[PDB]
């Protein structure tokens, strides 16, 4: 899944 601070 996408990182925490995701883009």
């Amino acid at each position, epitope marked *: *899944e*996408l*990182e*925490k*601070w995701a*883009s």
Partner: antibody
Amino acid sequence: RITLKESGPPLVKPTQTLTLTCSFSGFSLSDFGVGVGWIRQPPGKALEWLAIIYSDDDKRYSPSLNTRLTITKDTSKNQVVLVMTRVSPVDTATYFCAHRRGPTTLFGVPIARGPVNAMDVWGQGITVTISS
Amino acid sequence: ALQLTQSPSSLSASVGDRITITCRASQGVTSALAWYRQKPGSPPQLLIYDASSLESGVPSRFSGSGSGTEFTLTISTLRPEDFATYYCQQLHFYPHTFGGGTRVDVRR
């Protein structure tokens, strides 16, 4: 100045449970968006990401090790603990904990997320050998 | 999961050379990529964060560029302390993958 240091048993036997502690200074796990992660390195091999925990308490784990890892924090003691169950010989490695910056803020307003893209300060690493 | 491939895996060079290490991702990771240098017996040290920002206290001969699926680290004038292993790390998707590393050693 941020510093981190890993501690735990240097030797552990197969099937046992391994508890590693990261004690740090220079930041608080209550600071905005900060993270502390764990990375390991079997001798002669590449770095392998294990898990990370943030100050708002979100936790994430390597999918390959998810079932054997638990990461937790103790904010008031400035420590992050990683518990790995059922270890086997392939878990012998040097284990590092590391700091991850949270976004830069201006008058408490997040304005830059570029600084979160790296683990910026690392502990010296603790060598763990798994053998019966 | 997401794959990060470093090239070359090993590289020989001499003091004063310009080297460039590259890292390619299987899916785009935007600019969430970091480079590290790790000397034998020591922990990895952050050189470049967010694909191209120079980490504070890191010497200017180190440079990082690229975004998406292709990134490069170049050391413009290799110094003796640069004989080491370099790693790239992606932080866009969990898990936060590391590349296989590239060993830089003394050419002969």
